[PDB]
Design a protein around this ligand. Sequence first.
Ligand SMILES: Nc1nc(N)c2c(OCC3CCN(Cc4cccc(Cl)c4Cl)CC3)cccc2n1
Lengths: 289, 286
Amino acid sequence: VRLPFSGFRLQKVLRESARDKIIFLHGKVNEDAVVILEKTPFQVEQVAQLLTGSPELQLQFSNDIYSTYHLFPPRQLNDVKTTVVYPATEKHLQKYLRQDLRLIRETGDDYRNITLPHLESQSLSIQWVYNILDKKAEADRIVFENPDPSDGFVLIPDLKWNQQQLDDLYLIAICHRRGIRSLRDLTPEHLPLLRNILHQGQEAILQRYRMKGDHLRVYLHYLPSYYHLHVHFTALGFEAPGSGVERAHLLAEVIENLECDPRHYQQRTLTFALRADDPLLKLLQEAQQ
Amino acid sequence: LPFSGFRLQKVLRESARDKIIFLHGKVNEEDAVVILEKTPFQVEQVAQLLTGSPELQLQFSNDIYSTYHLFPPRQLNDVKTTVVYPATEKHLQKYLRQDLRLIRETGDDYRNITLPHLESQSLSIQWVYNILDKKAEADRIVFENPDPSDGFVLIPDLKWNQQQLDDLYLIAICHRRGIRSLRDLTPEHLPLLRNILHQGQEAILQRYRMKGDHLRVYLHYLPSYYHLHVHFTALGFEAPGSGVERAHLLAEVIENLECDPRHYQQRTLTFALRADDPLLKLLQEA
Ligand SMILES: Nc1nc(N)c2c(OCC3CCN(Cc4cccc(Cl)c4Cl)CC3)cccc2n1
């Protein structure tokens, strides 16, 4: 009947997805509440009966054999799944919050003059990466390894993939070689490594999980989440966060770019998104005005 | 509706993630496809509802967590409904759920396998020509450069109900005829591509107040229809075919052509095909 509090005043949309028809709202009450609203899937019988029984339809437009409408269905199709977290702690607000993103186009020179110095101004640990590579941690999770210290890598499932089905298959290849921070460091010297990751990684997944290479999206992030070269292997059906064109770069194309254009990744402009509160965004914007 | 008496033949496709359903029905007893999609939330109106007397049913509760059924007022329950009628067999197969496989098409694969296979088909883009010729949707045009060679029409895509900016989605359709896809692009088309990118973004800034750094602007390969068009989408929208395996950023298409005139004839392109697509077999064979 009633929500477990009084007087909802919106502070912030923590996250919204128009694709998934879901929104996460931070509201002030009286104290903090999170309310999550999600539209519901259609039930076939409910739609089929609506379409034969006086539906309230209103034209947005038509063109040839196509027409689009606003439909206002009866109550049974209008359920909205509503999840209330109250009181919400700062941890709740942080787990749901996603910053709005802005696109930047970074020239080779912007990288050299602005981005790289900004990265060098930070002290970020990747010791967790080295512990895996050195077999001190997570050795039991490695699915495949090419042990070569120059051209080798380990393949490990993503932590959030429960390995309970192939629909959301997701593994990460991490190279043994140290000091390759991102796409920007890649030269023809790295072709053997990159080929190994692509071919051996796909083969390992075929053997272990019986998933063929043409069912795999294999790509790198730019900007990456940590600055030691790593490659994502996801089921093609799994539209994983970070597989968008504004972040993802297909390993096969990275290889072919290096093969025909050796300085590609030092010379060409790369496009990525930054959180609107990221100080790097302001630096690149200031440098580009 | 453009017909009477929808009799369900088949659920062609459904998604619980996207809250969408595709139905094949018999009408006027003719085939029709009807597509129903739940709409994005109206944030301020939802917040207004929550602070009032929303109609709720408690499904379960455990200390700080509770789950409800909310039944909003009529104005918040809009379902975007798209009708394809009369629907051909191509339409019925197109919307059928199907498994996708990736393929890497070399420049020679395209010329010797894909293009002949395309050229062999007879596909209608009458809706596209109706927009360009002002026979349909003329009132909906957001921006036009009418130059027959380097010009285009910018128009909200069918996908977008225009009711919120979170899923902002327009298409630029070039006036020039016979540019089928990426594969046809050469430096000849650079003025057109530049016009689309810069005039398209300026139009969106003026109309919607959305800056270029809030947009993801890209082409599809393979395209769903073979007349060059560009997708202008909110960066925050997980937009159709915006994945790396389909989307090509317009700015990069332009720069690729500037660096290598034959880029899109010579280079290998990667894209997904449906398992039941005969092109997939033809390419795998070759
Ligand atoms: N303004 C405007 N925009 C448009 N896009 C129009 C329009 O677009 C038809 C395509 C038809 C196919 N697919 C994509 C598609 C292909 C295959 C399977 C699926 Cl599941 C889908 Cl989703 C989007 C729509 C038609 C008529 C008028 C239009 N008018």
